[PDB]
Write a protein that binds this ligand. Structure first.
Ligand code: CSF
Length: 377
């Protein structure tokens, strides 16, 4: 065959993993690769080092038909090594399956590697708590078969459908939380079904790269020396982490921005409900897609050092530049943050809260929603 590797992801977590996979295999300069990473730009100085390297836009959680043009350049029998976001796996693979249909004599799927979008997969699984999980799995397998045979998507349980790819292809799942699958009793039928097809995201992978590869990885994720320097100060550090909303509604976006600024004040102001104390150097790590919500913090706060929103929080853990304390709105970065670094996690019963409780990320005490916090000032 000829193997072609596809790295597809509209979010941040799967892309971090996929770029790690690329880095680990970066000695091979001619392996055909197609990158469809919405939040990551491979620098030109890296691109020129590679041959058979291609890029595809994602739209509506699927690579566009520009994908076909790329694949058409590889005439022989081709095997696809596909890396995907778990939550959006069905849509992301849709055009690839469409191409295989057209070239069924030549194109085959070699294997799938799936990575969590983030907290969405867990919140969605939490909503399945009262279902006959075994029956859901069996029905999802049947509907996946229909999808593979007809090219048409219709799943009664879109959540469980994310976990039945093994009924069709060799697959490996990479979870942000393996504990969830092992601690949530209602998921026992799914944990058993998945058998030996999953593992945890390996956050120590960066430490196993050579120093030259580590530097390569950092350029792929946007972690420059200026940011590193800003984090190397001797003073104790607190990073306030931002969130976002997908709502376009101006009122909702402004509400999020206002509530988030108020939350920051509760951490940093002496009269705040979450006051961290004096002597912490304050940083802001905005959400990669926070937009004007991020700007609102920088425009209205004081004595805060920005960490470019496009830099994923987990990169700090890789480089050993984690701060003393971290607080802000619940987000996927808290799933991998060392427990000793948590100041307070705030939420905007609630399935996200339940997930965090099951995992011990938060304790038994009443959670704090940001609308329960007095408007300081
Ligand atoms: C329930 C739900 O919808 N969860 C999704 C989740 O599956 C994933 F789609 C995402 O992930 P989410 O928890 O926000 O953020 C996951 C990442 O983005 C980076 N990050 C985040 C925040 C921050 N201040 N600095 C960072 O660097 C970190 O790498 C982390 O792991 C996402 O957009 O990728 O956003 C959420 C939320 O829809 C959104 O948070 C609430 O509207």
């Amino acid at each position: 065959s000829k193997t072609i590797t596809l790295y597809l992801d509209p979010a941040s977590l799967p892309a971090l993993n996929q770029l790690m996979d690329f880095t680990q295999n970066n000695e091979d300069k001619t392996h055909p690769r197609i990158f469809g990473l919405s939040r990551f730009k491979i620098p030109d100085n890296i691109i020129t080092q590679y041959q058979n390297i291609h890029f595809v836009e994602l739209k509506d959680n699927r690579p566009t038909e520009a994908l076909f043009t790329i694949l058409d350049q590889y005439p022989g029998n081709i095997e696809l090594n596909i890396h995907l976001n778990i939550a959006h796996s069905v849509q992301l693979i849709r055009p690839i399956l469409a191409y295989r249909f057209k070239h069924l004599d030549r194109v085959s799927i070699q294997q799938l590697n799936l990575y969590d979008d983030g907290s969405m997969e867990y919140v969605d699984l939490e909503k399945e708590e009262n279902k006959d999980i075994s029956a859901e799995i069996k029905q999802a397998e049947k509907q996946l078969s229909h999808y593979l045979l007809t090219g048409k998507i219709k799943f009664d349980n879109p959540t469980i459908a994310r976990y039945v790819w093994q009924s069709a292809f060799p697959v490996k799942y990479h979870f942000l939380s393996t504990d969830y699958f092992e601690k949530a009793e209602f998921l026992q039928p799914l944990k058993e079904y998945l058998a030996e097809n999953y593992q945890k995201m390996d956050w120590t992978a960066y430490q196993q790269l050579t120093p030259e590869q580590q530097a390569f990885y950092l350029t792929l994720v946007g972690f420059n020396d200026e940011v590193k320097q800003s984090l190397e100060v001797q003073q104790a550090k607190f990073i306030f982490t931002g969130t976002t909303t997908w709502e376009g509604n101006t009122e909702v976006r402004e509400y999020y921005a206002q509530q988030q600024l108020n939350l920051l004040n509760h951490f940093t102001q002496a009269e705040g409900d979450l006051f961290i104390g004096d002597h912490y150097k304050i940083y802001f790590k905005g959400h990669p897609r926070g937009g004007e919500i991020n700007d609102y913090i920088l425009n209205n706060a004081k004595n805060i050092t920005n960490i470019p929103a496009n830099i994923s929080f987990e990169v700090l853990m890789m480089t050993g530049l984690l701060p003393d304390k971290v607080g802000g709105v619940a987000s996927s970065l808290y799933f991998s943050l060392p427990k000793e670094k948590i100041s307070h996690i705030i939420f905007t019963n609630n399935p996200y809260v339940k997930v965090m409780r099951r995992l011990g990320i938060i304790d038994e005490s009443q959670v704090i929603f940001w609308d329960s916090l007095k408007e300081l000032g």
